Amino acid sequence: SNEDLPISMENPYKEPLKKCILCGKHVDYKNVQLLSQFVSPFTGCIYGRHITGLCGKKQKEITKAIKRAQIMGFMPVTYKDPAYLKDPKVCNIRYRE
Amino acid sequence: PRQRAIQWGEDGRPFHYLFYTGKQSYYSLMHDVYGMLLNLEKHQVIGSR
Amino acid sequence: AKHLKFIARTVMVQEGNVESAYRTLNRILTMDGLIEDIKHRRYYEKPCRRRQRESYERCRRIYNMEMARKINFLMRKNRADPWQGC
Amino acid sequence: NVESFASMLRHSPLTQMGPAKDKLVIGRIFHIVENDLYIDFGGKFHCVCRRPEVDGEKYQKGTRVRLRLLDLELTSRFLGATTDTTVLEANAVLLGIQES
Amino acid sequence: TKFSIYPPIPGEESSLRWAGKKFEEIPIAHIKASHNNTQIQVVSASNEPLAFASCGTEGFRNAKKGTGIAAQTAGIAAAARAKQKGVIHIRVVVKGLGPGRLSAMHGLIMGGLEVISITDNTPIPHXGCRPRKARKL
Amino acid sequence: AGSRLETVGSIFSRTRDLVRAGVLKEKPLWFDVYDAFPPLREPVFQRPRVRYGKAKAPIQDIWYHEDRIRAKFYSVYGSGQRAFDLFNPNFKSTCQRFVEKYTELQKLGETDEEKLFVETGKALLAEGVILRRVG
RNA sequence: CCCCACUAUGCUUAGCCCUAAACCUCAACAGUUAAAUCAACAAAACUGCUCGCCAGAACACUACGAGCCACAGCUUAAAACUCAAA
Numbered sequence: 001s002n003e004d005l006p007i008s009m010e011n012p013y014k015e016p017l018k019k020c021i022l023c024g025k026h027v028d029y030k031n032v033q034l035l036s037q038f039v040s041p042f043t044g045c046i047y048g049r050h051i052t053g054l055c056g057k058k059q060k061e062i063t064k065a066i067k068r069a070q071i072m073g074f075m076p077v078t079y080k081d082p083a084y085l086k087d088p089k090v091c092n093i094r095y096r097e
Numbered sequence: 098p099r100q101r102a103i104q105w106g107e108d109g110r111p112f113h114y115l116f117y118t119g120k121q122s123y124y125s126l127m128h129d130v131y132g133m134l135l136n137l138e139k140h141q142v143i144g145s146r
Numbered sequence: 147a148k149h150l151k152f153i154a155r156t157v158m159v160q161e162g163n164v165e166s167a168y169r170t171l172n173r174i175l176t177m178d179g180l181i182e183d184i185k186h187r188r189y190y191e192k193p194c195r196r197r198q199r200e201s202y203e204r205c206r207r208i209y210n211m212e213m214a215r216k217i218n219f220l221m222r223k224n225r226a227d228p229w230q231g232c
Numbered sequence: 233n234v235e236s237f238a239s240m241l242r243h244s245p246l247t248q249m250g251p252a253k254d255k256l257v258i259g260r261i262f263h264i265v266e267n268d269l270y271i272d273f274g275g276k277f278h279c280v281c282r283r284p285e286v287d288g289e290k291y292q293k294g295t296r297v298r299l300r301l302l303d304l305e306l307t308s309r310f311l312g313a314t315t316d317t318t319v320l321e322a323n324a325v326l327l328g329i330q331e332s
Numbered sequence: 333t334k335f336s337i338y339p340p341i342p343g344e345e346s347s348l349r350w351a352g353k354k355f356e357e358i359p360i361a362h363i364k365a366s367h368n369n370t371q372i373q374v375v376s377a378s379n380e381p382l383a384f385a386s387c388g389t390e391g392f393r394n395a396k397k398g399t400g401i402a403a404q405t406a407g408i409a410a411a412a413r414a415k416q417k418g419v420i421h422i423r424v425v426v427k428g429l430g431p432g433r434l435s436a437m438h439g440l441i442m443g444g445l446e447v448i449s450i451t452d453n454t455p456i457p458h459x460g461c462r463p464r465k466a467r468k469l
Numbered sequence: 470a471g472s473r474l475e476t477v478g479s480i481f482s483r484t485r486d487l488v489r490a491g492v493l494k495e496k497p498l499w500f501d502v503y504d505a506f507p508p509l510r511e512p513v514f515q516r517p518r519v520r521y522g523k524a525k526a527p528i529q530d531i532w533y534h535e536d537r538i539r540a541k542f543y544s545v546y547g548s549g550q551r552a553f554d555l556f557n558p559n560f561k562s563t564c565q566r567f568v569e570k571y572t573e574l575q576k577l578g579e580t581d582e583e584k585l586f587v588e589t590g591k592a593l594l595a596e597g598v599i600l601r602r603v604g
Numbered sequence: 605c606c607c608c609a610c611u612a613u614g615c616u617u618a619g620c621c622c623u624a625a626a627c628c629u630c631a632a633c634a635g636u637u638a639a640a641u642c643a644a645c646a647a648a649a650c651u652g653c654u655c656g657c658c659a660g661a662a663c664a665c666u667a668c669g670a671g672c673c674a675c676a677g678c679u680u681a682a683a684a685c686u687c688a689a690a
C-alpha cells in the first residue's frame with residue numbers, strides 16, 4: 001500500500017521501570033549493617049516505605065529481617081547500633097537541629 | 098435624555114462588527130487601546146484625574 | 147530494660163542551650179510517632195475505633211497530598227496577565 | 233506525485249526528535265511580560281521562562297534562545313477527574329541565547 | 333571538631349570531658365514527670381543516691397503538685413542537696429509527659445547544675461498491659 | 470414558531486420537519502446551502518460515554534522502523550550537543566544523519582544489528598561528525 | 605455520666621452454646637461498555653443463567669407446634685382484634 005504509514009510495534013523509547021536501592025540484592029537477617037540503615041537512630045523505629053523509598057517486596061523483607069535479627073540476638077530493638085551511625089544515609093528523614 | 102441610535106439598517110445587518118457583544122462601544126475602545134499597546138512594543142497627576 | 151542506656155532518645159546539649167536540646171528531642175520523638183503513641187495509649191482504644199481512625203488518617207493524607215499536587219500544578223499560571231485588555 | 237500526510241509526518245523534525253525530555257531545541261521569544269519570556273520552539277504550545285539574571289536585557293522580542301525541553305504539554309489527571317487537566321504550555325528550561 | 337548530638341559511646345576513645353570526668357562518670361538526674369506530680373532523683377554513675385525532691389516533699393498538695401512551678405521548685409531543692417555533695421554536671425533522664433517534664437529541668441539549672449545531655453525514658457509498651465477504658469466527658 | 474430541542478435530531482432535521490408541517494413560513498437562509506453541500510456527519514447531539522471493562526480506544530501509537538535506531542543512538546551517544554531547529558522543515562539532526570547512514574548500510578546487504586551499528590559510527594567520524602559516547 | 609477499690613469475665617485445657625449493624629447493608633457463575641446513561645441516594649449502566657427470598661403497616665427477633673448438650677436459650681414462625689397509611 002504505502003511505505004510511509006506507521007507500523008505496529010512496542011515503544012522503542014520506553015524507559016526501564018524504577019528500582020529500589022535494594023532491588024536484586026539478598027536481604028539477610030545477619031547483615032545488621034544493611035538493616036540498621038532503615039531504622040531510627042534515636043528510637044530504633046523501622047521507617048515506612050515513604051522514608052526508605054523501598055518497594056513493597058523489599059520493604060517487607062527488610063521489616064521481616066529486622067524483626068528476625070532483633071529477637072535472635074543480632075540487632076538491638078530500642079536504638080540503632082552506634083557502630084552503624086556513619087554508614088551511608090539512604091533515608092529521606094532529617095532530624096538534628 | 099440622549100438616545101442611542103439604531104444599531105442596524107433595513108437589511109438587518111448591524112453597523113458595528115462588535116454589535117453582538119452587547120457592549121460594542123466599550124469593547125471597541127478596549128480593542129483600540131489594546132492595539133496601541135502592541136504598536137508601542139513593536140516600536141520599542143496633581144491637576145488631572 | 148536489657149538494652150544499653152544513654153543511647154536511645156538521647157540528645158547532647160550544646161553551649162548550655164538546654165531549650166534547643168529539649169526542642170530537638172521533642173522533634174525526634176514527634177517525628178518517630180512516640181508522642182502520639184504515648185497519648186493514644188493513656189486509654190484503651192478499641193479495635194473498631196482504631197481501624198476507623200487509621201482509615202480516616204490514611205484517606206485524609208491521600209486527599210491532602212492530592213490537593214497539594216493539584217494546587218502546585220495549577221499555580222504555574224499564576225504569572226501576570228499576558229493579554230491584559232483582551 | 234503529491235506527498236501524502238503519512239509522508240510529511242514521518243520526515244518531520246518534531247517526529248524525528250522522538251521523546252522531548254532532555255532535548256536541546258532553539259526557541260524564539262514572541263511575547264514578554266515583565267520578566268516572563270514567552271518562547272515558541274516549534275511545538276503545539278509555547279513555554280514560559282523567567283528572564284535570566286545575567287544579560288537580562290539581551291532577551292527581547294525576536295531573540296532566538298536555546299532550551300532544554302522537559303514536556304511538550306504539561307498535563308496531569310487528578311483524583312475524581314474523567315479527563316486530564318492541561319495548563320496549555322510546555323515545560324522547558326532556558327539555558328541562554330543562540331549566536332552565530 | 334563539629335558538634336555531635338549523639339552521646340559518646342562507652343568503650344570508644346572520645347575527647348569530651350567535664351571537670352576531668354568522662355560521660356560515663358557524670359551523675360544522672362532522674363525526673364519522673366507524671367500528670368499529677370514530679371519526682372527528681374540525682375544519682376551517681378555507680379547508682380549511689382545523692383538527692384531527692386518532689387512536688388509533694390516541697391509542700392505542694394493536690395492539683396498544685398501538677399504544675400510547672402511546683403516541679404521547678406522540686407528541681408531547685410534537688411540541685412541544692414546534690415550540689416553540696418559535689419555535683420556540677422548531670423545527665424538528665426526524664427520519663428513521662430507530665431507538666432513538670434521541662435520545668436523540672438529548669439529548676440536543676442537555676443540550682444547550680446549544668447545539663448550536658450537530655451534522655452527520654454518514657455515507658456512505651458510494644459503491644460503490654462491493657463490501659464483503662466476511655467472516659468466519657 | 471420553532472424548536473429549541475437541540476438534543477432532538479439536528480438543526481437540519483428539525484428545520485426540514487417544521488417546514489414540512491407548515492410551522493415555519495420561510496426556510497432559513499442557510500437551509501438551501503446545507504441541503505446542497507451537507508456535512509460528512511449530520512450534527513446530532515450525542516452524550517460521550519465512558520469505557521468500561523474490555524473497551525479500549527482504537528487510536529494506535531505511531532511508530533517507525535527507524536525509531537528503534539533512534540532509541541539506541543540516544544542510549545549510546547545521548548542527545549547531540551547540537552540543538553534541534555524545529556522551525557526549519559528540512560532540519561537534520563545528528564541522529565537522523567546516523568539513521569540515514571544506518572539505513573544505507575542495511576540496504577548493502579548487511580543484516581547483523583550490533584555490527585551494522587558500529588560501522589555506522591565509523592563512517593560519520595570519517596565525515597567529521599562528533600560522536601561522544603555517554604559512557 | 606466523673607473518681608477509687610474489687611469480682612464474674614477477657615487467657616489456657618476439654619466440652620458445650622450457634623447469636624451479631626455476622627455489613628462491600630453489592631447472592632454465585634458468565635458476558636457487554638453499544639444502546640435509553642440514569643426515579644433519588646449509594647457503589648457507572650446492563651445482559652444471560654441458576655439457586656435463595658419477598659408480596660401494606662403493626663401485632664411479631666411474638667404465641668402454638670416441632671427440633672436442638674441449648675431449660676430466663678436458639679432456629680423455623682402465624683392468627684385474631686386495629687389502622688389508611690407504614
Ligand code: FES
Pocket residue numbers: 018019020022023024054055056057058
Ligand atoms: S524495585 Fe525491584 S525489588 Fe524493589
Ligand SMILES: [K+]
Pocket residue numbers: 627
Ligand atoms: K458495614
Ligand SMILES: [Mg+2]
Pocket residue numbers: 626
Ligand atoms: Mg464483620
Ligand SMILES: [Mg+2]
Pocket residue numbers: 631632655
Ligand atoms: Mg448462592
Ligand SMILES: [Mg+2]
Pocket residue numbers: none
Ligand atoms: Mg406484613
Ligand SMILES: [Mg+2]
Pocket residue numbers: 665
Ligand atoms: Mg435475636
Ligand SMILES: [Mg+2]
Pocket residue numbers: none
Ligand atoms: Mg423465640
Ligand SMILES: [Mg+2]
Pocket residue numbers: none
Ligand atoms: Mg415453644
